[PDB]
Amino acid sequence: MGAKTSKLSKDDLTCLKQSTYFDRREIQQWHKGFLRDCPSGQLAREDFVKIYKQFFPFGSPEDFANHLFTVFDKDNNGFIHFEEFITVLSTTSRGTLEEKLSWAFELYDLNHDGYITFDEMLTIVASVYKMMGSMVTLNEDEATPEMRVKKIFKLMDKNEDGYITLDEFREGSKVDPSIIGALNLYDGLI
Ligand SMILES: [Ca+2]
Ligand SMILES: [Ca+2]
Ligand SMILES: [Ca+2]
Numbered sequence: 001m002g003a004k005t006s007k008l009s010k011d012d013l014t015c016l017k018q019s020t021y022f023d024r025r026e027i028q029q030w031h032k033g034f035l036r037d038c039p040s041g042q043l044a045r046e047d048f049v050k051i052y053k054q055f056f057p058f059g060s061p062e063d064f065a066n067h068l069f070t071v072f073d074k075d076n077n078g079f080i081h082f083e084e085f086i087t088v089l090s091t092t093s094r095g096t097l098e099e100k101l102s103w104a105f106e107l108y109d110l111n112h113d114g115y116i117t118f119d120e121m122l123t124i125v126a127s128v129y130k131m132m133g134s135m136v137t138l139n140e141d142e143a144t145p146e147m148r149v150k151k152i153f154k155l156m157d158k159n160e161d162g163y164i165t166l167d168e169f170r171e172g173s174k175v176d177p178s179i180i181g182a183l184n185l186y187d188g189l190i
Contacts, residue, residue, distance in 0.1 A: 009027065018096055019094060021090050021093050021094045045066070048065045049061065059132065062127075063123065063127040067107065067127055072088060092187075101170055101173060101174065104187050105166040108121065110124070116156075116169070122149050125182065128185050129148075152179055156179060
């Protein structure tokens with residue numbers, strides 16, 4: 001016998017494989033720094049937002065930290081642990097195959113009826129918009145999510161059923177080169 005599979009350092013790499021966008025040198029730095037500020041290692045919803053705020057004091061990342069944190073966690077404890085915290089930050093940058101697509105869907109389904117709803121869309125789509133800006137790009141451009149919203153759903157639920165299931169998402173998304181831009185705006189930058 002030897003080491004199982006539930007530790008922090010080292011165990012991460014083994015799992016974070018195919019991604020690990022934070023070589024040991026990094027996660028180790030925050031590890032000791034995070035446990036120092038919290039010997040119990042527990043990032044609560046409040047903390048989460050606090051970090052997003054300082055990052056974008058000009059925006060209002062409120063429902064953002066909520067939606068995500070809500071459709072996250074694994075121990076249903078109401079608190080994000082170190083390994084869990086970075087899991088979020090990681091998926092934020094870089095990805096791979098449809099894996100990133102499936103995850104996004106679950107996040108948009110504010111509820112869980114295996115089906116998404118226009119209500120759950122505007123709410124989320126609005127969170128990513130009210131968060132980051134758009135003038136840091138190049139060509140001035142703007143649009144109340146109301147427009148991009150009607151566009152995102154119009155192409156997602158191209159089957160008429162009030163609600164849309166993941167299956168339809170991967171299809172209308174993986175194909176129609178357009179919904180990905182917005183849908184991605186939420187997931188995270190490149
Ligand atoms: Ca947790
Ligand atoms: Ca739904
Ligand atoms: Ca549908």
